[PDB]
């Protein structure tokens, strides 16, 4: 009946997606510019509960560190004012033409080594600012073709760059953890580190892995026409599920960006049930653009559009779990036997238990239907709101 | 000038690939079935190394222990008339309408406790016919719908499951290794770790994860819109290609399983340039389909044209390293910079380094340009055999 | 408040579809076939109007004519028993292993020429049975590689065909019309005439293209990516909806046959608000698959929701459009202005009006935004059945 | 062994091409902006026939009549001392913010309007450069959200804007064509004809359908998964490729516009063949864009590869059409019989034919193999230069 945010829910956006201006690559700028203090503004009297930030979205690239002390005090007078926190905060190493080839993986080392002190510049004033979480989207990582990329000296300098980040945040004693984005392609050809799962696994060998974490994106993994709750799910396994960037996408093609629940709205449903029932407890992200098409007022109809949608879903998602017919019909699919050890009893008692091979009925087994498309029409009904 | 295979190359094929009998979703077989006997003489004749088999392409599902001992037989007497190995071998967990669920997530416990004991009954005779790798595809391991698999107790089970197979190997003495082969979908709607990078990242929370590795598909990281050799220079980097399957996909669609050379050819020799220049020594294994438009004169020509276009690549691939020209490209592009490290003098260095960032000539940076178009189409020009 | 369908819904379902035991390229059947007879008598009692079938799911391939009018008969008792009807019927050029290469386009003659010998058969038969539409997919004309199909030789062949079918249903003076369903690929690794506009352009170059019209199925045009209620749209505006085939499909990947609702349900929304505000008028008709892992119980829980999601998708979009707020957004987004010409004045007034280029002021033009968001968050609302 | 291009190779470049500074939706400009006169020069000297333009890289948007006659003299007089000519033109409606709803199908009439106007003022300027062939993409046609562009409506907007041109030009006596250019996505979520069959489709409605053609572009069709070179055969089919785009293009994501040769290698082989071997006479126009890595060496040199590629795959295609081999083999496909009519005797003697189906062998035909992969394996080798 209610569907009104508020900071509790503990939404967020970043101040590029109500500030994206609606330049894309055929065609100019439809939006002025927003000062980031009317768009904390804005985003407060919504229902948010903070925003996120590049370096460069906050203070102009070649900034004096004088008006970079000016940028600031303005912006956190605003956060004081309105009660916004700020609980991520990124880098921009991807829209100066220096960063044409990457920032941790570009060929050149003088490259290399400036991203990371552009870097560990701005984690320091994240902290201040009181970022739980660093995310580090390597957009500009990769290749348009094969021979100007080595790739594993790219993940050993990768490796190298996340390793002496992590050596500063320790030696400083700072509480900030790292979150990496992975995403398929565009703006490079192929981007290293594409999905969740390759960002997964990158992890797993650095010198302090507890540290680094994955911000997945709804829309890029779609991009590669993956299931993103699944991606979640293995996520949430892992215990790496530091931060979520939500969205919407049509498929695989360019990113669209659109605004959470439109795109793929059963995903999104699928992925609403996996977060709340998972307790996920980080923020909400909202890492879209109002598309071009629109004025501000637009600008701030797509974004309360996202927090209506995700509310929306929430509701009908803990309705479909604690409806008893939905909780019959997960029984009758066998739910409750997957999440049962296959073999508690030990491989020696497997390979004794003759009920097991020798003496399986198989083609019982196999006759018994699994009842899916009950279950799946129930969570139809509920998403729609159609129960009877 | 000569593109002729022999069995110091390494070629292996599955007996289900000549042996595919050209049933497809839409189609009843185009081709009679093939005794493994003859497929073993006639790949032996071809200049292939050795075979692959699953559990049911060598004895037929419900063979008696008996009839199973007299099949295993004539196999290896095959094997002896003609030198031919047996480096893989794998378990069907797919095929048989108890499978239609998963194996070893399957939501019914009876069927995941009955598919680790055919596993378990097949590594036995893998390591009795001297394979090094076992391959595990869970080609049915997913779901069509969301409700139907919660993934992170599906996750429970694969991770349980492969536990217990490194313990049975284990208490067994057995020198043989895993490899799992990851697919995004089809047959199931999405299937548990669907790329490269996703099984990779499972494998890090297994209980020996030194025994497991993948065995990474041509067409599947494809159907997923990846850049294959970048994945493969993932897993190289990260020590776990234990095996491989090569084919050829046009795209994002269904698993064509084209030959080898077929699908996205320059993928397929930047793919070539980096497992010679990695030195990856195990077998290259096809693992496609000849089209059901063929007979078995068709058949025998598509499984030559493998090895044939592996051959030419590597001999394409090889002149383009060692071309001094491409060399000196190399050096125009600073491939050899990315292979040096960024900041060997260390953290603090690197802080107090005022040439990385309060000195750094931005736009001089900026303004070199790469130099990647010139090396991609001396790339191109060794490909294609246009060198002048 | 209701969902349940009548026959005047005229939902309609192929013999193929709740009738497919579960064969997928990788595994066996999982259901037993079902007797036709049984298929209408359960179809009927859900509701449906109607039944479809291909020659060969009706009459076994190499039926004597004795054997032929017994399946007929038979048929035909229980379409009176029922009430069903047969509004469409079609071939099947694409199981027997003949059809390797095509029916229409094989590249050799004899078979070009059984293929519609096999089809006008048919035609006969449908008739009889009182079809209106005869629809032809011809999911084998296509090719694997480049030199195995000229594909100029194969429209003219695609076109001769076509154009003697025509010539033979209009010597015979049937009622009854030609319906051609495209589709991307599968199981040809590219088919000819590949989407709805490929079909629509090849119609019109065919004798008599007042016969011919085309058969759109929702998975087919998204196994492309491609928006399908705009390519319904165009459809209907060239007048060549004749028929279509409703499902569902998760993205770019094989042919999932979901059931229609499943798969993208935002373009479903779309899709039946556009039926229903031009007023198509011919059969709802459902080519899908229930999943191989149901039994029989979960088949017609299949069959029923692809009809209870019509239905409630139905209502969502006519409360949608009746909706007095929404009819104020639709102007507001000057839906209004884009059907009314853009120059009924002429060509020379417009030439000679300066408030169209001289004297327009594209600045203020080009700041008015489209007001699209807001519209289509009531759009997300009304579907959700969250409006208040 | 030579590969330099003349200008009787008809190889043509747009202004737009090698003048791209490097923006793209992440990153600022890495090139400064060119001179459409350095260009005509720079051009010139690779070998190049002739240059085609937007209006607004000719003209800058908003110019005087007098800074407009200015900058076409300089451009004429670059023409003039180089031989360089002016094959095709077109209009930019997509980059002002204008434009940001469409030019022809904008909801807002009097945008529609303006974009008449200034397309048919750059008609005559096309005119007098002796262009033949007038190209409209309609990047901006099309629609992010469901509700906000009826399609039917669209396009009875866009008929009426095509007729008016067409009107426009046959009034005027010019020699001129228009050829449409489809792309299935980007900038908008879902552009109107979205593909070669859409377009072609399209055009069959217009008043005077001799006038308009369709101008394909190889990632355009790639980025919707479908077979380049099908598509073109189906236009020539037609008698309307009046113009082509080449570039290459890595699968379904956002554009590349790759060099030629790029992307799919074996697509671009069988595109050359096709339209050498049908005679293709107009421009081979290349729409691509430097990678932004490059400085301007790299684009010139990318340039150059476009031109290079072109004739490398024109020397392979032609030696293999021209080998005896092949010939024999593409009989052996029976691409001879697929050339023959199916049924030149009519339908009553395929009617009373009992050979052609009472009497025809059916699994005799179904044994004969097609003999393609041996087919297409020579194919490969020819692409490599690997024949012996
Ligand atoms: O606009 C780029 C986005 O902002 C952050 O860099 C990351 O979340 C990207 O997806
Ligand atoms: O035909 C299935 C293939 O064989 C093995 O199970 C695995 O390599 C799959 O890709
Ligand atoms: O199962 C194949 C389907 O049945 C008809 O042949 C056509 O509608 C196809 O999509
Ligand atoms: O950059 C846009 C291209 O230029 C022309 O407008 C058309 O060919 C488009 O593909
Ligand atoms: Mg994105
Ligand atoms: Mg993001
Ligand atoms: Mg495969
Ligand atoms: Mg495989
Ligand atoms: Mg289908
Ligand atoms: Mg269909
Ligand atoms: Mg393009
Ligand atoms: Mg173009």
Same mark, same amino acid.
């Given at each position: ?159 190298? @760059?996340?390793?002496? *980040?992590?050596?500063?945040?320790? /030696?400083? %004693? +700072? ?7 992975? $995403? &398929? ?81 059963? @995903?999104?449903?699928? *992925?609403?049930?996996?977060?709340? /029932?998972? %307790? +996920? ?7 879209? $653009? &109002? ?93 729609? %709101?159609?129960?009877?």
């Amino acid at each position: 009946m209610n569907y009104q945010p508020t900071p509790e829910d503990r939404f967020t956006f970043g101040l590029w997606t109500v500030g994206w201006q609606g330049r894309d690559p055929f065609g100019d700028a439809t939006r002025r510019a927003l000062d980031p203090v009317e768009s904390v503004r804005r985003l407060a009297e919504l229902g948010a509960h903070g925003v996120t930030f590049h370096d460069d979205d906050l203070i102009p690239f070649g900034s004096s560190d004088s008006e970079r002390e000016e940028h600031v005090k303005r912006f956190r007078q605003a956060l004081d004012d309105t009660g916004m926190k700020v609980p991520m905060a990124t880098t921009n190493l991807f829209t100066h033409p220096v960063f044409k080839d990457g920032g941790f993986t570009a060929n050149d080392r003088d490259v290399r080594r400036y991203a990371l002190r552009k870097t560990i510049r701005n984690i320091d004033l994240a902290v201040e600012l009181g970022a739980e979480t660093y995310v580090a989207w390597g957009g500009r990582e990769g290749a348009e073709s094969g021979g100007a990329k080595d790739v594993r000296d790219a993940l050993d300098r990768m490796k190298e @760059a996340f390793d002496l *980040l992590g050596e500063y945040v320790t /030696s400083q %004693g +700072y509480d900030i953890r790292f979150a990496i984005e992975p $995403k &398929p392609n565009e703006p490079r050809g192929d981007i290293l580190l594409p999905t969740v799962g390759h960002a997964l696994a990158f992890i797993e060998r650095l010198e302090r892995p507890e540290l680094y974490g994955v911000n997945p994106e709804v829309g890029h993994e779609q991009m590669a026409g993956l299931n993103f709750p699944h991606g979640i799910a293995q996520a949430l396994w892992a215990g790496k599920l530091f931060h979520i960037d939500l969205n919407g996408q049509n498929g695989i093609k360019y990113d669209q960006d659109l605004r959470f629940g439109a795109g793929d709205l059963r @995903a999104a449903f699928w *992925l609403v049930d996996l977060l709340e /029932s998972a %307790g +996920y407890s980080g923020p909400r992200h909202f890492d879209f $653009k &109002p598309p071009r098409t629109e004025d501000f007022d637009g600008v701030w109809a797509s974004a309360a559009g996202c927090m209506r949608n995700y509310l929306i879903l929430k509701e009908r998602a803990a309705a479909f779990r604690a409806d008893p017919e939905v909780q019959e019909a997960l029984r009758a699919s066998r739910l409750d036997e997957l999440a049962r050890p296959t073999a508690a009893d030990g491989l020696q008692a497997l390979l004794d238990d003759r009920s097991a091979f020798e003496e399986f009925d198989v083609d019982a087994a196999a006759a018994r239907g699994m009842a899916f498309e009950r279950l799946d029409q129930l969570a139809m009904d509920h998403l729609l %709101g159609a129960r009877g």
